[PDB]
Amino acid sequence: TFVVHEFAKELDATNISIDKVVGAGEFGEVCSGRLKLPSKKEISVAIKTLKVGYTEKQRRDFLGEASIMGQFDHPNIIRLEGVVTKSKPVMIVTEYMENGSLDSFLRKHDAQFTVIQLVGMLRGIASGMKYLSDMGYVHRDLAARNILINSNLVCKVSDFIRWTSPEAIAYRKFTSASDVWSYGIVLWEVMSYGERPYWEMSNQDVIKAVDEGYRLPPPMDCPAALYQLMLDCWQKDRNNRPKFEQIVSILDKLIRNPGSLKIITSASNLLLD
């Protein structure tokens, strides 16, 4: 069950080296480097720093991420290596993911992966979400931009209206079933190679169209089984959406029977139901 020092290792800064500054982040700089583990193994890591002259609120909000991430240990959830708090700048050190955010990565590779490669990505995301939901953690911001992808194309959940379920928009009813709605949107994003859900529709229209029963259309050459899975994730009644365990099983069956993916749906305009 989901509930800083309790869930995060205090790293010795002598074991951390920086070799690339990526850019600015919400609370400070973002870079990558190397971490020397206690066993002397050396690994690549992502490193995030807290800005000089931080406020106490900023420190709390920044480190709060580690207090959440550190509770999870799963191959499809970004791993927290630890934090540095006893020296400044304060740091969060996480799993290095060579290929960055999934949405941006897919946009660079439009139509260049096999369907089975895409399904593997999606199965990883679903497995990570099955564990988060098993822990009682509702992510609330599941989106391809918050999925990271490594050198072997393994996708992992990160970040601890377009993606939000209708009931969560209407009255802040956030549950694991609203995360399943979001997963359906991620499924569409992946099969669309990182197209923006609902493009640049007015937010009021995204809300109204979805409420009226309109859904994102099938991505080009989308397997029928995968578009149906999207529609299932987007059931108006949250009790009728699949659980994450069911999503993982559905995708595992498609991987086991790749021929099933050859059945292509029939089917920038939304489709009613």
Side-chain angles (χ1 to χ4, degrees), residues 158-179:
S158 185
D159 193 5
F160 291 92
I161 297 300
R162 288 162 155 71
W163 290 266
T164 304
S165 72
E167 71 278 358
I169 293 168
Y171 71 114
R172 301 194 280 256
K173 185 54 62 183
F174 286 95
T175 66
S176 289
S178 57
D179 279 349

Side-chain angles (χ1 to χ4, degrees), residues 130-196:
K130 199 274 183 181
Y131 190 55
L132 292 179
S133 56
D134 272 5
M135 294 284 283
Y137 183 79
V138 178
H139 190 288
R140 307 194 181 192
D141 199 24
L142 174 59
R145 64 183 187 284
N146 290 332
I147 300 302
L148 295 174
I149 180 170
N150 74 12
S151 71
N152 296 141
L153 307 185
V154 178
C155 291
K156 309 192 185 209
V157 180
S158 185
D159 193 5
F160 291 92
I161 297 300
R162 288 162 155 71
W163 290 266
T164 304
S165 72
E167 71 278 358
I169 293 168
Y171 71 114
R172 301 194 280 256
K173 185 54 62 183
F174 286 95
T175 66
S176 289
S178 57
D179 279 349
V180 166
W181 179 286
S182 303
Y183 181 86
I185 302 295
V186 172
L187 177 49
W188 188 91
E189 292 183 280
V190 169
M191 300 312 299
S192 299
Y193 285 86
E195 181 59 277
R196 178 175 172 78

Side-chain angles (χ1 to χ4, degrees), residues 200-220:
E200 283 174 278
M201 283 180 68
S202 190
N203 290 4
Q204 291 170 20
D205 286 320
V206 175
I207 293 169
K208 198 91 183 57
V210 169
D211 182 57
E212 290 178 13
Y214 286 89
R215 299 293 183 262
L216 292 163
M220 184 178 292

Side-chain angles (χ1 to χ4, degrees), residues 3-261:
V3 300
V4 182
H5 315 285
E6 186 177 359
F7 298 115
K9 301 174 198 166
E10 179 72 21
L11 300 170
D12 187 332
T14 80
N15 292 118
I16 298 165
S17 55
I18 294 173
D19 56 30
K20 184 170 169 60
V21 184
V22 77
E26 187 179 358
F27 294 94
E29 287 188 311
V30 176
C31 58
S32 58
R34 303 284 285 182
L35 176 64
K36 187 70 159 175
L37 300 174
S39 62
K40 313 304 192 186
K41 296 181 176 63
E42 292 172 15
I43 60 166
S44 294
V45 288
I47 303 159
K48 149 162 173 168
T49 63
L50 179 60
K51 65 175 284 194
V52 176
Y54 59 86
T55 61
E56 290 299 324
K57 188 181 189 304
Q58 281 168 335
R59 184 182 190 279
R60 283 194 298 268
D61 292 354
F62 181 78
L63 289 175
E65 176 186 1
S67 299
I68 295 171
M69 189 188 296
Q71 299 187 46
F72 306 130
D73 169 27
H74 186 280
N76 298 105
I77 305 293
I78 288 294
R79 177 175 176 83
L80 178 68
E81 291 295 334
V83 299
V84 179
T85 64
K86 296 180 174 181
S87 57
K88 301 181 188 186
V90 177
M91 291 181 166
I92 292 173
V93 183
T94 57
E95 193 164 6
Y96 177 72
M97 302 293 282
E98 175 167 324
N99 291 136
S101 290
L102 183 59
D103 68 317
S104 298
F105 178 74
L106 293 177
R107 282 193 294 274
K108 289 277 178 72
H109 297 294
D110 188 19
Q112 296 171 16
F113 296 118
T114 66
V115 169
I116 212 72
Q117 283 177 304
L118 296 177
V119 172
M121 295 175 191
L122 289 160
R123 193 274 186 201
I125 299 160
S127 184
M129 292 305 305
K130 199 274 183 181
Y131 190 55
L132 292 179
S133 56
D134 272 5
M135 294 284 283
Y137 183 79
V138 178
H139 190 288
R140 307 194 181 192
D141 199 24
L142 174 59
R145 64 183 187 284
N146 290 332
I147 300 302
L148 295 174
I149 180 170
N150 74 12
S151 71
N152 296 141
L153 307 185
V154 178
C155 291
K156 309 192 185 209
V157 180
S158 185
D159 193 5
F160 291 92
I161 297 300
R162 288 162 155 71
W163 290 266
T164 304
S165 72
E167 71 278 358
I169 293 168
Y171 71 114
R172 301 194 280 256
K173 185 54 62 183
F174 286 95
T175 66
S176 289
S178 57
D179 279 349
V180 166
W181 179 286
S182 303
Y183 181 86
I185 302 295
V186 172
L187 177 49
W188 188 91
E189 292 183 280
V190 169
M191 300 312 299
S192 299
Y193 285 86
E195 181 59 277
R196 178 175 172 78
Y198 312 90
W199 316 283
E200 283 174 278
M201 283 180 68
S202 190
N203 290 4
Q204 291 170 20
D205 286 320
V206 175
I207 293 169
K208 198 91 183 57
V210 169
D211 182 57
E212 290 178 13
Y214 286 89
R215 299 293 183 262
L216 292 163
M220 184 178 292
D221 300 319
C222 189
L226 294 175
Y227 191 58
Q228 184 66 53
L229 180 55
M230 294 174 209
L231 297 181
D232 293 349
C233 292
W234 302 328
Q235 286 302 119
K236 178 181 275 287
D237 185 342
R238 72 172 163 284
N239 296 138
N240 294 344
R241 297 175 198 150
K243 304 303 184 182
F244 279 113
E245 185 177 14
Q246 295 175 308
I247 296 170
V248 175
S249 298
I250 286 161
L251 296 171
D252 281 344
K253 200 177 282 297
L254 293 168
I255 293 166
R256 196 109 66 87
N257 183 30
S260 297
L261 296 163

